From a paper:
Mimivirus is the prototype of the Mimiviridae family of giant dsDNA viruses. Little is known about the organization of the 1.2 Mb genome inside the membrane-limited nucleoid filling the ~0.5 µm icosahedral capsids. Cryo-electron microscopy, cryo-electron tomography, and proteomics revealed that it is encased into a ~30-nm diameter helical protein shell surprisingly composed of two GMC-type oxidoreductases, which also form the glycosylated fibrils decorating the capsid. The genome is arranged in 5- or 6-start left-handed super-helices, with each DNA-strand lining the central channel.
An additional step of refinement focused on the asymmetric unit further improved the local resolution to 3.3 Å as indicated by the corresponding FSC. In the 3.3-Å resolution map of the asymmetric unit, most side chains and notably the FAD cofactor are accommodated by density suggesting that the oxidoreductase enzyme could be active. The N-terminal chain, being more disordered than the rest of the structure, it is absent in the focused refined map, and also absent in the Cl3a map of the relaxed helix, suggesting that a break of the disulfide bridge could be involved in the observed unwinding process.
Numbering used by the authors:
A (entry chain B), B (entry chain A): 56 to 700
Amino acid sequence: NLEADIVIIGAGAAGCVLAYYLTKFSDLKIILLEAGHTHFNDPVVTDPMGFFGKYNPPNENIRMSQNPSYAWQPALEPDTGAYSMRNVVAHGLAVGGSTAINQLNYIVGGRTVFDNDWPTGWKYDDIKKYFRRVLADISPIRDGTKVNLTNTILESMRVLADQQVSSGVPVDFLINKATGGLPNIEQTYQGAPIVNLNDYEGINSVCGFKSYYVGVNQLSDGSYIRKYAGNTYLNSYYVDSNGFGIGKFSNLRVISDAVVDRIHFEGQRAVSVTYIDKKGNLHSVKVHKEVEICSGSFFTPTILQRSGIGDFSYLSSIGVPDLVYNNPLVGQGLRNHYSPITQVSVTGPDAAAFLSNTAAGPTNMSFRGAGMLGYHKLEPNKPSNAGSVTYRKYELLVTGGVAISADQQYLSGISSSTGNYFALIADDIRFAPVGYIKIGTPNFPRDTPKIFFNTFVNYTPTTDPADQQWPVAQKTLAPLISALLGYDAIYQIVQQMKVVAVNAGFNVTLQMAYPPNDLLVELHNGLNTYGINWWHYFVPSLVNDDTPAGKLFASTLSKLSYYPRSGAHLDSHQSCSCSIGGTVDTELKVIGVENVRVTDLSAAPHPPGGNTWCTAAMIGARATDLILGKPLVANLPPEDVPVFT
Amino acid sequence: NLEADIVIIGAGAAGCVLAYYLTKFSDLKIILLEAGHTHFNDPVVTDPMGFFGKYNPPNENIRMSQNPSYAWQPALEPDTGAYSMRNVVAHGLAVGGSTAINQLNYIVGGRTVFDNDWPTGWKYDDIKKYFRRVLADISPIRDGTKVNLTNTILESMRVLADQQVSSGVPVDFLINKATGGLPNIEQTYQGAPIVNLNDYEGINSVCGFKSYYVGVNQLSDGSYIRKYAGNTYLNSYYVDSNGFGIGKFSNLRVISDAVVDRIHFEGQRAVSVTYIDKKGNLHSVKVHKEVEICSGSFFTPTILQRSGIGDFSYLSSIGVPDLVYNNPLVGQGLRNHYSPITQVSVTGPDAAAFLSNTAAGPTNMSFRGAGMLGYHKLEPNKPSNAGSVTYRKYELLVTGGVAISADQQYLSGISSSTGNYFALIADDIRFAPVGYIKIGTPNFPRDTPKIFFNTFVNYTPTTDPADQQWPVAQKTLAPLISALLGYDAIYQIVQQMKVVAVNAGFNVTLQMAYPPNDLLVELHNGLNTYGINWWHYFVPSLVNDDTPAGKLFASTLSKLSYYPRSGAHLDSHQSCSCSIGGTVDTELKVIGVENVRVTDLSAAPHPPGGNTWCTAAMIGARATDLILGKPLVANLPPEDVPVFT
Ligand SMILES: Cc1cc2nc3c(=O)[nH]c(=O)nc-3n(C[C@H](O)[C@H](O)[C@H](O)COP(=O)(O)OP(=O)(O)OC[C@H]3O[C@@H](n4cnc5c(N)ncnc54)[C@H](O)[C@@H]3O)c2cc1C
Ligand SMILES: Cc1cc2nc3c(=O)[nH]c(=O)nc-3n(C[C@H](O)[C@H](O)[C@H](O)COP(=O)(O)OP(=O)(O)OC[C@H]3O[C@@H](n4cnc5c(N)ncnc54)[C@H](O)[C@@H]3O)c2cc1C
């Protein structure tokens, strides 16, 4: 028997903060159901480099996100825009959730995304305190090793940002309007100050820096360890070995291996929750006040639909007997990021000194920069505010070795063994495609529901006059346009690096080796010779430009369209399944019911400006104050932090 | 309350026969738990062409094996031999199991596989009656439309089989030793008799025919319908709408949507089985005599391991509390088939007449032949009996259109729109690789367990002398050798077709367009100039043949090794997870327990000579007589068949 008045389902990035700070500041009885044990002893979780497979057995060399004993394994339906490939993108299965298996990065997101895309009450000035709270809770660190490649790249970026600042055009990709004429590029010399990307006031929307902030901490011995939600908020100092709380937190219960099925639900009010344990028995817990769903973006709409909230026609079709509320918007608007990869060759006799000091330590995890960039000059899909507000579009990442898939490694002829290649990535942060989630069987939580997500689709013309069917091709082709413009933005960095490396003491040469170089120079020339309407040549049957130059450009675009489909990576930043306004109101309460709330990343109405870990924790932190009634977390002094064991 | 003395889990190809003929011939109380409703009204299941997506909604065009509401969706761990790609291969989820979503083909398997690879009591003369039983139960039909391409191919096969019969070599791929000197190729002219591939006496181990036997039946209206296990054995004539039996079968209960978890198991004797229904409640059923597991190859070891039979150390590690029997061989020896694809171009002005009468009707489903072939002359991995017994190695299939993946369609430049291309496939029936299955969470039946299956791995040499490390490279390279020899066997058919099409009234030319033609002629020349030790050049660091010709051959082999990895298809013929001798004895009884048996395809000790649907039904049929005690099914007259509603 386990009656309690707050029941949280899932201890992820948001569940842990919620439980911890909700039992600290009140006397209600909190229950946390997670379905996964605590990996506080596993060397593959505590050690940061275990992310790269240092402790893997020889015969089962698979990463944690491919291990069914560490992660939920959802595979999406064939991708009609990527040659119908199905992708498996995972969720963490442990205390701490996906933060137990992630890359440990802290992009906070810009100021402008919250100011312009989130509803009132969620503007940036209303949430910055919670971001400060989560950052102070973790205390990330910076890179502990310098490298001259970062120097060369930073000089190149400032060199071309100088000419972008002039020329008067307003929406180039290195223009930050909160700083003014001077470029927002970190200085590169002895004793240079560090431009902080997650700054408090949100000044830096577009900036170039030399290091990220990764969530690890150094021990007195010398070893580094992971610092995740389950490490800080539910550790042996705050919770017993039996799951009971201790002292201040004695009003807290955590059940370890408890897979939750649905919400037994009297009238339109929640009254009980059932789950299954490792024994195989079914248990019921009684609810007095509130149910919180923090089960992740893929599996929150699933449990909501199984309970009875969703589309009545479909749910009746598959066989859900108990219907509650007819909201056909549950599980809509799924969003994600997407990172295409380019890689560059260095030609010379003694390039080793140029690529030295790049191996992955636990303080950077192979990230060496390099910045956040805004919209390209020639992208037609921009918000109207772009003239007066700087948005975040691309996240630039530089890494050693090759990062393409193994099949592409064979096909392109470039191998990971050689030592004159390095990778650049322009991750898309405002990715356009939208998908959705539905369940297929109303029995128990299934590992694979129906997930639909099509990215790089094409446009099939009609007999409509060309003048009035361009502005549907624009929307249908947005992602391909953005990926190609990212290719161009990376390409026009490398000759700047040529100049900088020449005048910094290096006899080296840099060229883009993947995709093929000529295929990129042709894109550069096509862009600068066709202007703002360059993208019309994606559909060659409407341009009516039958000249051989136009045919060349169209063929180049068609050939380039292959690379982002196959030689890229879909990220694991799922969100917005049950966003604000769609499924829940500003108070995180589900429409059509009076005592259930959803507070994980699946409630965000727009993805943040980068990696989506701070946002989920912030949502949980604000849910704490929403539930209790008055702001206690928002006013805690920053010197009060959870101690670590 | 549902006590009964026989409880079957899963109504697949073997569960339906077992339940039907076990309640017909006895008075025990039979219960069948399936976890899936009856699709007797769904047009996408009853109509054969619904397999190809005739009734699919426009926005969700996915086949039945990719639909989570029709199939279990297991994805295997990254394939170290295929550029680390994860493949999703499904199981049927309905009455009838995988036969509700399959291709409807009836390869029975040869005589020699059962005579040489299965234990005593399971030789061919001990089982042929049950194969006749299942075939008479279904009554498949042959192709209802002729085509001249089959004529040309059959002439070509007999032409080269004539010269293979001479030349005295004993193990070519068109030699059948049960017929003698004359070729075993169907005659090709007016009123020719039909050589039956599933013949009663098992004479035809290697034969060339013009049609397969697909499991459909024609109605009086004119429409064809699917004829599967759930259609024949559990239909409205034998089982009520409520799941009760009727009259003769009144001693039978079928529960529709019941997902089974584990076996509650007193002492070392089975006493109860628990399941979950669509309501979300957990039910228990009492067992008096027997439990049958017919849950498929992927999910039978899963339920056995969750119950408590398996490896104690690992099961304790993941958290199974109740341990029963320590058999570390549960879930070992997983086998499957594998089909690489080649495709051929026809060059000429009026090839349309040559490729006419090839569209897929419900009586062939785009299969137009062409035979079963034995070992190639130059394969080193052959059983010792191969001199005196003919084994089945390849299954040859001919089809219209292109059958490669969409990515390969783009890369190779060949498109499905054009009308001068057709596909050939040499499916490997004695596929060498072996994998295994383990569970990752002891809570509930998960859709994705750990499945390990690596196919086309490479050999890394050591400092061991070359003379005494060849016979480990042979075993490690068996699958690649077999695939390449299949490529060669297909290639040396097309010039025979050149001659036959010339002398049959056609001005057409045939050449292998995928893989590239020169890459195949070089393989042909390398084979005939390097002899039986041609495969030594897979590892170029040991041959010590530094001549440029040897370098050419090694490069050709390395380039050809890419095609079977990416341009092929893994089949859905899983088997042998709990085979005879490994997990169960000759009586299908699980070792370490006295009242549980497993009777689905996961009990086969060696895959059959072709498509694995007749074998599963045969196993169920023999289990019927094993359970009752005396042969009632083995002596039923062939004119007694289940009527159809
Ligand atoms: C491969 C990978 C890489 C990542 N890289 C980064 C990165 O570079 N930067 C970054 O900032 N973030 C990264 N992340 C993390 C990710 O971006 C966010 O942290 C994530 O969205 C956190 O959201 P969440 O806490 O709401 O969900 P989760 O953390 O996934 O919470 C899910 C929790 O709910 C539980 N649960 C689910 N279903 C049930 C059920 N039926 N019953 C009971 N419990 C249930 C699960 O066990 C788990 O504890 C990565 C994640 C992965 C997997
Ligand atoms: C895509 C595809 C193509 C195929 N093509 C061919 C072909 O060309 N030729 C051919 O001969 N065969 C074909 N097959 C069929 C296949 O080769 C065999 O018929 C199959 O191995 C049948 O084995 P089975 O009956 O033991 O397993 P299944 O038929 O898969 O039986 C599984 C049954 O167990 C049930 N079950 C599983 N787990 C549970 C659980 N926990 N609780 C309750 N019930 C459970 C499932 O609901 C299902 O009813 C194809 C199958 C597929 C999927």
